[PDB]
């Protein structure tokens, strides 16, 4: 309406636009780092996971949901929480551990009693084995994880840089590893609990594998998110600049009229 108003609104967006675009290149940069974390964890995913295929391992339930603490990344947390919810009907008595606040917020609006542990301050650097392992150490201790017949990891699977895929995968406990169909295809030394170790190692590992893919999926969503934000932010800037110029011109004309009216007498 007034030039002073239109001056600040135009200049406000002029920043949001430069902001979102700076966060769109910060994303693209962080994406080279992302595939060095995805691929390097999808290969450790063939190797680690292959034992279980050959041994033919199959199986109160423990759900671990994985996203992050940070917004501005499309529908990453929205539809993952939607996959957990969809699954949660078929067994409402599940115990939920949330990795990321945004996902905790989502499931706290819908299943607050099911949430027993929340892992925080995650989305920053890429996921490491230490976070992976220390979360795992908490699950085993505080959640008593080893006692659930069913453990599930929900995370986003990056099919490409353009879209992702909310996914699920199971973690088998010691009992289930032992009793698997083809567990006696392997000359395992029957001594110092190997199923115990293989479980607690796989609990950390497949969590990391999940985080590492969810990460990658988020960075590629945040990029695409910022890319349109910048596109709209920039398109708004054009319409406001146009409005500015009208209002500038109008301020000159109207002051000039007062001055002309004043001299007229």
């Amino acid at each position: 309406a007034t030039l002073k108003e239109v001056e600040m609104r135009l200049k406000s967006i002029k920043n949001i636009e430069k902001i979102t675009k700076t966060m769109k290149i910060v994303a693209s940069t962080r994406l080279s780092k992302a595939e060095k974390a995805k691929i390097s964890a999808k290969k450790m995913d063939e190797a680690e996971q292959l034992f279980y295929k050959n041994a033919e391992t199959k199986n109160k339930e423990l759900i671990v949901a994985i996203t992050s603490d940070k917004g501005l990344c499309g529908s990453i947390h929205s539809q993952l929480a939607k996959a957990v919810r969809r699954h949660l009907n078929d067994q409402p008595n599940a115990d939920i551990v949330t990795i990321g606040d945004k996902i905790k917020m989502q499931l706290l609006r819908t299943h607050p009693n099911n949430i027993k542990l929340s892992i925080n301050g995650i989305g920053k650097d890429a996921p490491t084995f230490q976070e992976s392992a220390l979360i795992a150490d908490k699950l085993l201790s505080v959640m008593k994880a080893g006692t659930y017949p069913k453990i599930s990891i929900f995370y986003n699977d990056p099919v490409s840089s353009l879209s992702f895929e909310p996914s699920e995968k199971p973690i088998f406990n010691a009992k289930t590893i032992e009793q698997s169909p083809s567990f006696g295809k392997f000359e395992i030394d029957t001594d110092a609990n190997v199923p115990r170790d293989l479980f607690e190692y796989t609990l950390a590992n497949q969590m990391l594998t999940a985080m590492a893919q969810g990460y990658a999926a988020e960075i590629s969503a945040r990029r695409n998110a910022m890319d349109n934000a910048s596109k709209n932010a920039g398109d708004m800037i054009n319409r406001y600049s146009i409005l500015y110029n009208r209002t500038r011109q109008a301020v000159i004309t109207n002051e000039l009229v007062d001055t002309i009216t004043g001299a007229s007498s």
Binding site: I242, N245, R246, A250, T253, L256, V257, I260, T261
Partner: protein, 128 residues
């Protein structure tokens, strides 16, 4: 154009463009010392156009059934259809064909913007 309307035939009139006419008009008004108003156009700039486009008409049976059809051209600045003169002529005509600069540069020509274009009376006159 009216001679044809008045005598029983049909004439088409194209005003290319009214924007420039209204500019010419404001010049005189200012030089005559008529109070400037919105965008420094005189108060009667609407009347300038309205009296003109009112002469475009379709006559009854009793008057030979002659027709004057007007196609005024208006030039917007940076696609702003909210300006004083554009809205004035929009408010006199029976619709407008709005041509979007965005489509025109893209190659889509005629560059008709569908949402922003309307004929107000045409349907009942368009070939079935």
């Amino acid at each position: 154009g009216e001679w044809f309307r008045d005598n029983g035939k049909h004439a088409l009139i194209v005003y290319d463009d009214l924007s420039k006419q209204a500019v010419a008009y404001r010049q005189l008004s200012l030089l005559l010392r008529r109070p400037p108003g919105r965008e420094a156009y005189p108060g009667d700039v609407f009347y300038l156009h309205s009296r003109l486009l009112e002469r475009a008409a379709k006559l009854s049976e009793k008057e030979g059934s002659g027709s004057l059809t007007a196609l005024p051209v208006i030039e917007t600045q940076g696609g702003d259809v909210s300006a004083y003169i554009p809205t004035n002529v929009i408010s006199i005509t029976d619709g407008q064909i709005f041509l979007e600069a965005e489509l025109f540069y893209k190659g889509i020509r005629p560059a008709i913007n569908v949402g922003l274009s309307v004929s107000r009376v045409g349907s009942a006159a368009q070939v079935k």
